[model samples]
Target: GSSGSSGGQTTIQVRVPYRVVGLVVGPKGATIKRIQQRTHTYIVTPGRDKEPVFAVTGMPENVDRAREEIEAHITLRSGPSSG
Candidate 1:
């Protein structure tokens, strides 16, 4: 094991269209499942009535990766003009 740099874990929140939540989450939750594994982060989707908000919790770097994947997923499908 390597020497630890004791860093605080953080949670990042992202909002996506509620309508696209199902696809983003994927059938059987596989999409989010894959995301968490790929980024090594924990993602929680506390769906909202209009715009679904999800939170990713983990190491800062991992959290950021998770957020990127999520935003990419939404952008790829929803085609939002937030590049």
Candidate 2:
């Protein structure tokens, strides 16, 4: 699914820590689904146990927002001590 951006949709790839994947995904994938729905982007999580790399593809603004949401979720889950 390609969005009709003049330069074409942008793609953002984020490699999250393995542990944080659960928080980003939420229970039964609710978190990921929410991000996708809110941003109108496509998100993919690797199926295997390797490092967690989230691939998000969409308009630049949407992709950036999604990245922010994911990062915010990770920070919230990690608490203030997280760096």
Expressed as tens digits, the lDDT of each residue in 1-83 for candidate 2 is 56755577889998787878888987778779988998889998877757788999988899888988887776784435556
List ranges where model 1 is wrong by over 4 Å. Answer: 1-7, 48-51, 77-83
How many clashes would you count in candidate 2?
A: 0
Cand. 1 TM to true fold: 0.73
Q: Quantify all predictions' global Cα lDDT against the true fold.
A: 0.79, 0.83
Candidate 1 has which clashing residue pairs, if any? none
Question: In candidate 2, which residue pairs clash?
Answer: none
lDDT (0-100) at residue 25 of candidate 2? 84
RMSD (Å) per prediction:
6.1, 5.4
How far out, in Å, is residue 17 in model 2? Answer: 0.9
Winning model by TM-score? 2
**Candidate 1 structure quality by residue, lDDT tens digits, 32-59:** 8999998988898774444688789898
TM-score of each: 0.73, 0.77
